[PDB]
Write a protein that binds this ligand. Structure first.
Ligand SMILES: O=P(O)(O)O[C@H]1[C@@H](OP(=O)(O)O)[C@@H](OP(=O)(O)O)[C@@H](OP(=O)(O)O)[C@@H](OP(=O)(O)O)[C@H]1OP(=O)(O)O
Ligand SMILES: CCC[C@H](C(=O)O)c1c[nH]c2ccccc12
Lengths: 567, 90
């Protein structure tokens, strides 16, 4: 009966379970839509603001994602799309009670922010994960107007730095801040303003600073914020002075609730030890910006038994990770990044042995992101043997099409073992010398995989074909410079309807074959992204630079730049 | 109380026709149809939650099976909704 159903329904908050209930009968479909709080829109060209606004009239929370992931590899030219305005414009009149907007890879303008700011009164959560096209002017507006803001989070967004003055536009009555991430800003924020700010916000649990806040000033901020759960330092360098070191140490251990630490730009090894009070309770640590050497990292890490997430340069080294491996029995996710990728000859001693270590040593390692220069099937075999529970595995070998360096063989059995043994592998990403055989492996075993990425691998369409044909759970495939073209794509065209997108760029997909797919598949949107003029100025059989296929229920988009073509 | 200790829980209240004898017992021992009727917000929150679990993560069919709802969807409507659900909203 309507009321009790509404009450049962409010417990169900998973999208998959919401969809599931919307499909149990015409009545459930109706109760359900009216009391839906959040919409996840993974691909914003998949549906239209208007369609959404009428299905789900009382929505409090909107998450939307724009350009596909290979925009991070600078492979989606400016202008492509992403525009969020239409979304804001639509919700602006329909969604009075809107509380949050989390956007990923979108274009957002000062205009949009103005509009958010003036249309949304209960507004509380703005997350802009790698966006562009607003400036600090945009931010001012939000600071000025959003009486109720709880989160302002600008993870690797790319802002126009007009000035640090935006943060002072926050009025003195403002106190509700829970979360501030301003690490991508370069605009030096006014320190007084920031300090008064931190002080009158008792609920602020996450504070993430930009480089412009000097080490010397950190201590002062922490005294005002003793309840911090997450801190991102600003700069972490200074003249070495024990007044300085000590003020740090004190302030920091005054934060009994700190779990997560990052920032640490130009970190001076002398000033790291201040953070040891913290160490024994840390669960996340991100040392990606710190070029500190191995022993240092080591000294830091033995302190961290509860550590669950670790991001770090390759400075850690195998010795580094052997320690990690005995120390952090609770490690869930490790990301090792490179210190110098445009050099094929090592500067650190990071090898496969590193990852192998961690894998025997951490019963709970399930996420991996690892850059080395060398690799073996022996290593991948062992890894796969140790971690049947693995769920995201992204390896990345600096010099491409590099083979197993002991045997010289390609890495197919390597990666074959991963996909055979990690029965829940939901993400996989690949490198080194690989032949179609790996894909046969993926297609046979990767039954739960959702996301695959591939570059300089494979022999012929027979490879993409095994993936399209084998991977039941596939949601996202994305491919660059592989010998894959028309045969696999057309052979498997209806797979594309059970998938969120295919990116193929610098591959062998011909304009002709794009044309034909578009024809066979009205409900897809087969976009050709190409910058050398019209594709008929070229013979049908020539490869396009990039094609981006994706299902949608909104048909072709209206905002295509001029190097973009729907078929 | 038909068909002042800790009997004020019900804001339908603080003499009953839409309740029974074996039912009233179970309430005092501390359906949902009731739990409601009466306004006892914590018991409404007891049942509505665990019920929502009979549901959590089961197929639409799988739910109406383990309940008793007749599917009243023309395959036209059933397929177009599932398409929207999966392409746009999951
Ligand atoms: O594709 P990425 O640029 O790598 O980014 C992410 C992400 O990866 P990160 O770990 O780097 O944030 C998650 O995927 P997992 O690592 O957890 O696999 C994620 O969001 P979830 O937290 O919901 O998984 C989402 O994937 P999705 O929307 O497919 O669930 C998404 O990929 P997008 O580029 O698609 O946002
Ligand atoms: C390790 C770098 C992150 C990325 C990914 O894991 O998705 C990636 C890892 N290796 C790759 C090969 C081709 C395209 C993307 C990738």
């Amino acid at each position: 009966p309507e009321e009790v159903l509404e009450h049962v329904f409010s417990f169900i908050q998973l999208d998959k379970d919401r969809n599931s209930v919307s499909l149990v009968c015409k009545s459930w479909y109706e109760i359900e839509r009216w009391c839906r709080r959040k919409v996840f829109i993974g691909n914003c060209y998949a549906v239209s603001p208007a369609t959404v606004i009428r299905r789900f009239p009382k929505v409090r929370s909107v998450e939307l994602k724009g350009k596909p992931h290979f925009a991070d590899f600078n492979l989606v030219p400016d202008g492509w799309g992403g525009y969020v305005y239409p979304w804001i414009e639509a919700m602006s009149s329909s969604y009075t009670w809107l509380e949050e907007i989390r956007l990923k890879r979108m274009v957002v303008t000062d205009d949009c922010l103005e509009l958010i700011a003036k249309s949304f009164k209960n507004f509380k959560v703005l997350v802009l994960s790698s966006c562009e096209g607003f400036s600090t002017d945009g931010l001012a507006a939000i600071a000025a107007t959003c009486r109720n803001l709880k989160e302002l989070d600008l993870r690797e967004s790319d802002v126009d730095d007009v000035s640090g003055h935006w943060l002072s536009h926050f009025p003195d009555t403002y106190t509700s801040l829970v979360s501030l991430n301003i690490s991508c800003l370069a605009s030096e924020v006014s320190f007084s303003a920031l300090e008064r700010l931190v002080t009158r916000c008792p609920n602020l649990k996450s504070l993430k600073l930009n480089r412009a806040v000097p080490l010397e000033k950190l201590a002062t901020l922490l005294q005002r914020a003793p309840q911090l759960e997450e801190l991102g330092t600003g700069g972490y360098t200074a003249e070495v002075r024990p007044d300085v070191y000590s003020g740090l140490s004190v302030a920091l251990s005054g934060c009994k609730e700190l779990r997560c630490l990052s920032g640490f730009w130009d970190a001076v090894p002398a000033y790291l030890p201040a953070v040891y009070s913290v160490c024994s309770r840390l669960t996340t640590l991100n040392l990606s910006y710190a070029t500190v050497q191995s022993y240092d990292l080591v000294k830091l890490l033995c302190q961290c038994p509860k550590l669950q997430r670790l991001w770090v340069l390759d400075y850690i080294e195998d010795a580094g990770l052997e320690v990690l491996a005995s120390t952090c029995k609770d490690l869930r996710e490790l990301r090792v990044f490179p210190s110098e990728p445009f050099v094929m000859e090592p500067n650190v001693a990071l090898t496969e042995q590193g990852l192998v270590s961690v894998s025997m040593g951490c019963p709970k390692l399930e996420s991996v992101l690892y850059f080395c220069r060398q690799m073996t099937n022996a290593a991948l075999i062992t890894i796969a043997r140790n971690r049947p529970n693995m769920t995201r595995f992204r390896l990345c070998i600096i010099e491409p099409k590099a083979p197993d360096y002991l045997t010289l063989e390609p890495l197919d059995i390597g990666f074959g073992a991963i996909v055979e043994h990690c029965k829940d592998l939901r993400r996989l990403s690949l490198s080194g010398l690989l032949t179609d055989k790996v894909f046969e492996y993926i297609g046979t075993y990767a039954k739960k995989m959702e996301m695959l990425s591939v570059a300089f691998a494979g022999d012929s369409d027979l490879g993409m074909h095994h993936v399209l044909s084998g991977c039941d759970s596939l949601r996202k495939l994305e491919i660059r410079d592989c010998p894959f073209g028309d045969k696999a794509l057309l052979a498997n065209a209806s797979k594309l309807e059970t998938m969120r997108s295919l990116w193929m760029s610098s591959c062998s997909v011909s304009f002709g074959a794009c044309k034909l797919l578009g024809q066979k598949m009205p409900k897809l949107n087969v976009e050709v992204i190409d910058e050398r003029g019209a594709p008929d100025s070229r013979p049908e059989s020539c490869p396009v630079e990039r094609v981006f296929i994706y299902r949608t229920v909104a048909g072709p988009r209206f905002d295509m730049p001029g190097f973009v073509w729907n078929m | 109380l038909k068909s002042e200790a800790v009997a004020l829980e019900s804001q339908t209240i603080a003499p009953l026709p839409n309740v029974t004898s074996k039912i009233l017992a179970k309430v005092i021992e501390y359906l949902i149809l009731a739990a409601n009727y009466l306004n006892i917000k914590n018991l409404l929150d007891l049942t509505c939650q665990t019920v929502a679990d009979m549901i959590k993560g089961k197929t639409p069919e799988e739910i109406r099976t383990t309940f008793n709802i007749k599917n009243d969807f023309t395959p036209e409507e059933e397929e177009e909704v599932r398409r929207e659900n999966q392409w746009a909203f999951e």
